[PDB]
Amino acid sequence: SGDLYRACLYERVLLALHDRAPQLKISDDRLTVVGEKGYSMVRASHGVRKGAWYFEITVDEMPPDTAARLGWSQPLGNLQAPLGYDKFSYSWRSKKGTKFHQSIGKHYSSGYGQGDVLGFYINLPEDGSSEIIFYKNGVNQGVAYKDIFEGVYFPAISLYKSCTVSINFGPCFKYPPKDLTYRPMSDMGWGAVVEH
Amino acid sequence: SGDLYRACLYERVLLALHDRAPQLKISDDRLTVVGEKGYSMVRASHGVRKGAWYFEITVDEMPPDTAARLGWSQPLGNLQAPLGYDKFSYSWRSKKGTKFHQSIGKHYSSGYGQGDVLGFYINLPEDGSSEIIFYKNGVNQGVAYKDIFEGVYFPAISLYKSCTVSINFGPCFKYPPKDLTYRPMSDMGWGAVVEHT
């Protein structure tokens, strides 16, 4: 078959063009972001509703008195609040490695900080128990949340004061999980196949 | 600017649809191939004419009486001969690590075999301008050929008897070279920016 040889449309997965707190400072390549004062948030350009997906964030710089809450958000997530502030998102906090959802912080892992490469895994099986799992430098930190609200989840970054992080949607990861199957978030960019 | 958010056309880089010795057994995903009796050869779907490019090949299985010659070929390279048989291709042989061109084998590296991940770099004019360099498990084996014939070069695999190899055009390599810059062969798949979108 020549089916595999056909051209198709591809679009980049990036931090969002307009779906972002306007105070966050985003790089020209749309993959690096710097915080500004109180917590505020940006979602990726693409989100997922079914299957298992993965992305990475590198904490480029995290000066004293700065922080991040990183994770996944539905579209209704509040852009002018920390990730995990409401029922629409789940986050992992740099400080103390606390997990947040609905403004409730619970024990999870130890903290993370500058230079760490964080991993973000989600599994939304279809008609299967949904799960959110975080990784730190390739090490599985455990299931943080199970049976989460059904919906579309976007990779999401919220930052407090002027720390800097970089997001990598794939397909090439620094610490690919050895214990789980998934697709890189970059696979969300594949579109219609062209006939020839 | 919304420019980076625009759609682009992309086609996969694979072992060729028809440009292949028919006795070679190629997998459904078009990235794994098994030899059959005498040496025979297959080229990739895309070739390069300028710039620096890279791909990898993993030797999945190589029983005692089998072998490979791997490298780059122009379109006129003989499909029913080992790679490096004529003036249209340049190859690296599993047995003894010999380099072949125009059926002349010269000393190059030590051999390679089952389990090894081989790297293939080429640099074509643009700007001893052109060069072919081979890698084993991330180690640069040295410059094999300089000032090669002008033309378009395709990644190319020739196999002798029933050994099995898999090709990785990129973008994610197991042993990305640290000493050279290049584009993955997978980048040959990129087409025009479009509206759709």
From Swiss-Prot, chain A:
It is found in: Nucleus. Ubiquitously expressed. Predominantly expressed in adult heart and testis and fetal lung and liver, with barely detectable expression in adult lung, liver, kidney, prostate, and peripheral leukocytes. Both monomethylated and dimethylated on arginine residues in the C-terminus. Methylation is not required for nuclear localization, nor for MLL complex integrity or maintenance of global histone H3K4me3 levels. Residues 2-174 form the B30.2/SPRY domain. Signal peptide: none annotated. Residues 2-196 are annotated as: Interaction with RBBP5. Interacts with HCFC1. Core component of several methyltransferase-containing complexes including MLL1/MLL, MLL2/3 (also named ASCOM complex) and MLL4/WBP7. Transcriptional regulator. Component or associated component of some histone methyltransferase complexes which regulates transcription through recruitment of those complexes to gene promoters. Component of the Set1/Ash2 histone methyltransferase (HMT) complex, a complex that specifically methylates 'Lys-4' of histone H3, but not if the neighboring 'Lys-9' residue is already methylated. As part of the MLL1/MLL complex it is involved in methylation and dimethylation at 'Lys-4' of histone H3. May play a role in hematopoiesis. This is Set1/Ash2 histone methyltransferase complex subunit ASH2. It comes from Homo sapiens (Human). The lineage of its organism: Eukaryota, Metazoa, Chordata, Craniata, Vertebrata.
